[PDB]
Ligand binder design. Structure first.
Ligand SMILES: [Mg+2]
Ligand SMILES: [Mn+2]
Length: 494
DNA sequence: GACCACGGCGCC
DNA sequence: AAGGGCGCCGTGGTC
């Protein structure tokens, strides 16, 4: 490469080095661009950002997020991770991708920008002909990355003083349970230690081991095992409560307050777009897709996610997206009439534990299942309604437990992959319309979305987002969305 | 201090 | 609903 002066011309690939992975917390240590043969290294990274028109490169969405916290509208566009990930969703990291498609992922910004150019070449080449993957790329994954960049930049508001109060309460009850259990044991021990607990239950007290752990073969102390021993001994219910409280305190109540961003007053996740085997997003640092919901204490934690003052949260949930998608994929004239007729699938068919089990093993269903394994064995991958693929190679393993595990992965992906393609497309469609009404998209939770709207315009945003989500891509069966509205996530009623 | 494997468990 | 998909915690441990 011919090392050239900043700035680069239109359309260059960008490479950048961050002091850490979270773009909302990162310092920009270096910035470069590459096009043709030349590398352009920016003398001053942050000022240099202003001269870009869009982010084009490996991890584009991360640079667009950093740009966005700094006040600049720099959207991402082309990203070789996205194409690689469409080709094989086992392509999740730039290290892997680089090694696979012709480069080395290093820590130097110039070499990353170069790397980007050569990789996109090599990958856009592997997508000539793959016309459905090209479509998910142009119409879903590339535009979506702009939307997730803005969601990440915006963040969600948290009531800290509430969480600090919950924390003291919960520390008090933890103390009650732990004293309870130590006396029952006749001695004190580390209750967060599954090994010392295991000695207590099974060696010291007389209780029956029910399961062994996978990798090392210790007697399990999982919830399953403890539920099975609930009647056997009073120490057990206490341990179950202790686990519950300490899980929620260690994972949500204590750390989340400390992640509030000084400049925004909000919490900012990463929505990872190339992290999953099925085309779902993941969320990390912190994960906001696993905020508690089933227990009382869980629901009190969920009250802590709140709208800005004067706004409201708008929570929208697809009603059994996966069964409805199974109806469309399999074409079972019967299962479709069940949804088209507005009726509750769980009633017409105890039974919920067969509607949901048949995802993993009504005849067009079995037919669908069997055709899926066959095309999986033949081609080596299965696919979604939109043609997203997951390669499942052990479908022909000669060990039954591995083949059968593989079959379960193979069944699952077309339905999970499809529900995901749908939610992804629907975010892409919904985003620009929310902006037009000054509303925000805050979170995605697989088949749910959380938006924030000015109180005055909330019922109208909810009406609009519902129709957009319901009509995203009509299928033999209707997609149903439940909408809720409220001042906190629990009241909004997701 | 950073990283690790494991068991365990939060959500979809 | 979680025989599928995730990410995060503390422990016991290395380096
Ligand atoms: Mg829900
Ligand atoms: Mn599972």
């Amino acid at each position: 490469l011919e090392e050239a002066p900043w700035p680069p011309p239109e359309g260059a690939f960008v490479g950048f080095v961050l002091s850490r992975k979270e773009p909302m917390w990162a310092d920009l240590l270096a910035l470069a661009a590459a096009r043709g043969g030349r590398v352009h290294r920016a003398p001053e990274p942050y000022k240099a950002l202003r001269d870009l028109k869009e982010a084009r490169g490996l991890l584009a969405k991360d640079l667009s997020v950093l740009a966005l916290r700094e006040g600049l509208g720099l959207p991402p566009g082309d990203d070789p991770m996205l194409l690689a990930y469409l080709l094989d969703p086992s392509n999740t990291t730039p290290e892997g991708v680089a090694r696979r498609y012709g480069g080395e992922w290093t820590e130097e910004a110039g070499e990353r920008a170069a790397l980007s150019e050569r990789l996109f070449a090599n990958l856009w080449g592997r997508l000539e002909g793959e016309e459905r993957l090209l479509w998910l790329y142009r119409e879903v994954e590339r535009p979506l990355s702009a939307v997730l960049a803005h969601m990440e930049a915006t963040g969600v508001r948290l009531d800290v003083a509430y969480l600090r109060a919950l924390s003291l309460e919960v520390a008090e009850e933890i103390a009650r349970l732990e004293a309870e259990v130590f006396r029952l044991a006749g001695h004190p021990f580390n209750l967060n230690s599954r090994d010392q607990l295991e000695r207590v239950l099974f060696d010291e007290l007389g209780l029956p081991a029910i399961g062994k752990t996978e990798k090392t073969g210790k007697r399990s102390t999982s919830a399953a095992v403890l539920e099975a021993l609930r009647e056997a001994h009073p120490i057990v219910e206490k341990i179950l409560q202790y686990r519950e409280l300490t899980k929620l305190k260690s994972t949500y109540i204590d750390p989340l307050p400390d992640l509030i961003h000084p400049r925004t007053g909000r919490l900012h996740t990463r929505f990872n777009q190339t992290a999953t085997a099925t085309g779902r997003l993941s969320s990390s640092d912190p994960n906001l897709q696993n905020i508690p919901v089933r227990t009382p204490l869980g629901q009190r934690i969920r009250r802590a996610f709140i709208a800005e003052e004067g706004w409201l949260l708008v929570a929208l949930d697809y009603s059994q997206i996966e069964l409805r998608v199974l109806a469309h994929l399999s074409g079972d004239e019967n299962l479709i009439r069940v949804f088209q007729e507005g009726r509750d699938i769980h009633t017409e068919t105890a039974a919920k534990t067969i509607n949901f089990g048949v995802l993993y093993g009504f005849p067009k269903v079995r037919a669908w299942l069997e055709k899926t394994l066959e095309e999986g064995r033949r081609r080596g991958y299965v696919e979604t309604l939109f043609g997203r693929r997951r390669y499942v190679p052990d479908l022909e393993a000669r060990v039954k437990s591995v083949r059968e595990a593989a079959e379960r992965m193979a069944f699952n992906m077309p339905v999970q992959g499809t529900a995901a393609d749908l939610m992804k497309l629907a975010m892409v469609k919904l985003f620009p319309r929310l902006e037009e009404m000054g509303a925000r998209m805050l979170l995605q939770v697989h088949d749910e979305l959380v938006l924030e709207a000015p109180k005055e315009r909330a019922e109208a945003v909810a009406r609009l987002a519902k129709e957009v989500m319901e009509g995203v891509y009509p299928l033999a069966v209707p997609l149903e969305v439940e909408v809720g509205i409220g001042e906190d996530w629990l009241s909004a009623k997701e």
